Design a binder for these strands. Structure first.
Ligand SMILES: [Mg+2]
Ligand SMILES: [Mg+2]
Ligand SMILES: [Mg+2]
Ligand SMILES: [Mg+2]
Ligand SMILES: [Mg+2]
Ligand SMILES: [Mg+2]
Ligand SMILES: [Mg+2]
Ligand SMILES: [Mg+2]
Ligand SMILES: [Mg+2]
Ligand SMILES: [Mg+2]
Ligand SMILES: [Mg+2]
Ligand SMILES: [Mg+2]
Ligand SMILES: [Mg+2]
Ligand SMILES: [Mg+2]
Ligand SMILES: [Mg+2]
Ligand SMILES: [Mg+2]
Ligand SMILES: [Mg+2]
Ligand SMILES: [Mg+2]
Ligand SMILES: [Mg+2]
Ligand SMILES: [Mg+2]
Ligand SMILES: [Mg+2]
Ligand SMILES: [Mg+2]
Ligand SMILES: [Mg+2]
Ligand SMILES: [Mg+2]
Ligand SMILES: [Mg+2]
Ligand SMILES: [Mg+2]
Ligand SMILES: [Mg+2]
Ligand SMILES: [Mg+2]
Ligand SMILES: [Mg+2]
Ligand SMILES: [Mg+2]
Ligand SMILES: [Mg+2]
Ligand SMILES: [Mg+2]
Ligand SMILES: [Mg+2]
Ligand SMILES: [Mg+2]
Ligand SMILES: [Mg+2]
Ligand SMILES: [Mg+2]
Ligand SMILES: [Mg+2]
Ligand SMILES: [Mg+2]
Ligand SMILES: [Mg+2]
Ligand SMILES: [Mg+2]
Ligand SMILES: [Mg+2]
Ligand SMILES: [Mg+2]
Lengths: 117, 201, 103, 48
RNA sequence: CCCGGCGAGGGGAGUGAAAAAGAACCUGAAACCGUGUACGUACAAGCAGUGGGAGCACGCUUAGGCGUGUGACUGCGUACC
């Protein structure tokens, strides 16, 4: 029984070359060059599911600092004062109130000042 | 055991150990697989690098030309060269133990009885070697795919069944495991049942 | 009018009539769920802050869907070391609709 | 019982080893031989 | 029948189930080379992707947001054997 490789081999190259569309030059036309590109894009995506959680917390913290310094307090003292008041709202919600509701954010700052005093 | 008869409502007595066993599937599978291995021919071959036509000259010199090194035009890497692990004629038959071959027969016959695929008669014959004659008899008994085991070979029964591909005729001495399974229904005369037990025992 | 509550290890800020996607809940696709652990309620310049929960605050919702999210691919590769491996993933969610906020 | 309803016993049909057929199989490339010796060569090894 | 050198090549008419079956004639993949449309691009430094993300075009069918193409700007990042 002789076995020919033509039909299976062709379908296996087309799967890789479809994941590589939008790339520049030979990276979307040639199998040897495109296979390496698809491998590297999967390595980066695994790593960047970790860095995504770092880049967003860092952004919330910089916006709470800016809105706190405008009410006469810093980020360090604001966060310590909320722990002593037993307020369990987290960074993501706080950076959202600071943009869309500045009246409620001021009420939070007055509660942290009272706890520190 | 006791086997009923359809054409004469008699009773025929047989052995329990030949018709009352349980099914040994692992044993039957081995004997059936070894039967089909014994049907192969095994006739084929290819050419190695030593059997392709051509001389033993070295295509170009070892060093200096800027090409990969070559030693033979009959290399299995070149187009029109030899086959690396070429085939030879071979024999595919397997050995089956005598007690194992006979044990698998007894569990095939024992299971045909449980599923009602075996029926016993006294006589089965036709007057003349005519296909139309045998075809009529089968339709009365409501049989389409059938294997007929008879005690002694009949010249007229053999000839009348030749042109019907769904009907096969044997004698007791010529039973094989595969055709007992492949046919929908099995018809054995009383004389055939007597000899089969004797050869199995 | 909005409230903040926690569910599934995360926190959410919602308004009435909104549809929110959470982690998988053990509730049938038609029933109503209840959230009694509310962190704050803001009602247009009247603000209530929980220490850590607002007394008497509760949020009512209705389960509207179950399903699995989009598929992601895991790719591991160690160059020059003869090693490679791949995997796929698909995460379960639950959608609810906010029907009533009360303090 | 039919010709397409018979199976063998469990544990009697171990599959053979196939060397040099990719990374995932666990036997690709060198095929279980190691690196660069007399014992790794075609025909290599010492007499009894 | 028409253009053309009483050419090569082509457009009609006709045959045929089919001519994109027309003799360089079954099917007709990939590398490679073109014409058309949408978006980007002439103050900008590097394995050319990946995480975030506006604007534009287009289809939306509860008018809601969704799908598809492009990708200004920005964090991280020196191919494979
Ligand atoms: Mg063939
Ligand atoms: Mg391949
Ligand atoms: Mg191309
Ligand atoms: Mg292409
Ligand atoms: Mg290739
Ligand atoms: Mg020759
Ligand atoms: Mg010589
Ligand atoms: Mg010579
Ligand atoms: Mg040859
Ligand atoms: Mg013998
Ligand atoms: Mg790498
Ligand atoms: Mg290993
Ligand atoms: Mg070994
Ligand atoms: Mg080596
Ligand atoms: Mg060494
Ligand atoms: Mg060594
Ligand atoms: Mg060694
Ligand atoms: Mg080696
Ligand atoms: Mg060697
Ligand atoms: Mg040698
Ligand atoms: Mg002239
Ligand atoms: Mg002409
Ligand atoms: Mg016509
Ligand atoms: Mg044809
Ligand atoms: Mg053609
Ligand atoms: Mg093409
Ligand atoms: Mg434009
Ligand atoms: Mg411009
Ligand atoms: Mg410009
Ligand atoms: Mg400048
Ligand atoms: Mg620079
Ligand atoms: Mg440049
Ligand atoms: Mg750099
Ligand atoms: Mg990007
Ligand atoms: Mg994005
Ligand atoms: Mg624009
Ligand atoms: Mg622009
Ligand atoms: Mg970038
Ligand atoms: Mg960088
Ligand atoms: Mg870099
Ligand atoms: Mg490096
Ligand atoms: Mg490398």
């Amino acid at each position: 029984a002789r076995v020919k490789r033509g039909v299976i081999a062709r379908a296996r190259h087309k799967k890789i070359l479809k994941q590589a569309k939008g790339y520049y030059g030979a990276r979307s036309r040639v199998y040897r060059v495109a296979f390496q590109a698809v491998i590297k894009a999967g390595q980066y995506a695994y790593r960047d599911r970790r860095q995504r959680k770092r880049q967003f917390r860092q952004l919330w913290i910089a916006r709470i600092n800016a809105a706190a310094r405008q009410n006469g307090i810093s980020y360090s003292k604001f966060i310590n004062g909320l722990k002593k008041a037993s307020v369990e709202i987290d960074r993501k919600i706080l950076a959202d109130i600071a943009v869309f509701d500045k009246v409620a954010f001021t009420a939070l700052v007055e509660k942290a000042k009272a706890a520190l005093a | 055991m006791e086997l009923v008869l359809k054409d004469a409502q008699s009773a025929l007595t047989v052995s329990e150990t030949t018709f009352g066993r349980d099914f040994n599937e692992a044993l039957v599978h081995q004997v059936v697989v070894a039967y089909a291995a014994g049907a192969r021919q095994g006739t084929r071959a290819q050419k190695t690098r030593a059997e392709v036509t051509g001389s033993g000259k070295k295509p170009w010199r070892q060093k200096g030309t800027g090409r990969a090194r070559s030693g033979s035009i009959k290399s299995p890497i070149w187009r029109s060269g030899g086959v690396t692990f070429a085939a030879r004629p071979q024999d595919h038959s397997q050995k089956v133990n005598k007690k194992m071959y006979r044990g698998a027969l007894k569990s095939i016959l024992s299971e045909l009885v449980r599923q009602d695929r075996l029926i016993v008669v006294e006589k089965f014959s036709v007057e003349a070697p005519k296909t139309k004659l045998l075809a009529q008899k089968l339709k009365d008994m409501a049989l389409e795919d059938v294997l007929i085991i008879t005690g002694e070979l009949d010249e007229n029964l053999f000839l009348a069944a030749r042109n019907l591909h769904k009907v096969d005729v044997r004698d007791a001495t010529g039973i094989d495991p595969v055709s007992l399974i492949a046919f929908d229904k099995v018809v054995m005369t009383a004389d055939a049942v007597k000899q089969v037990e004797e050869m199995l025992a | 009018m909005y409230a903040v509550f926690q569910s599934g290890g995360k926190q959410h800020r919602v308004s009435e009539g909104q549809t929110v996607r959470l982690e998988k809940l053990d509730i049938a696709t038609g029933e109503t769920v209840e959230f009694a652990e509310v962190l704050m309620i803001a009602n247009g310049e009247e603000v209530k802050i929980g220490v850590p929960f607002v007394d008497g605050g509760v949020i009512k919702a209705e389960v509207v869907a179950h399903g699995r999210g989009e598929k992601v691919k895991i790719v591991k590769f160690r160059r020059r070391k003869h090693y490679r491996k791949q995997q796929g993933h698909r995460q379960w969610f639950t959608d609810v609709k906010i029907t009533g906020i009360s303090a | 019982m039919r010709l397409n309803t018979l199976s063998p016993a469990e544990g009697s049909k171990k599959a053979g080893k196939r060397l040099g057929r990719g990374i995932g199989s666990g036997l690709g490339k060198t095929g279980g031989r190691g690196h660069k010796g007399q014992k790794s060569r075609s025909g290599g090894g010492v007499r009894r």
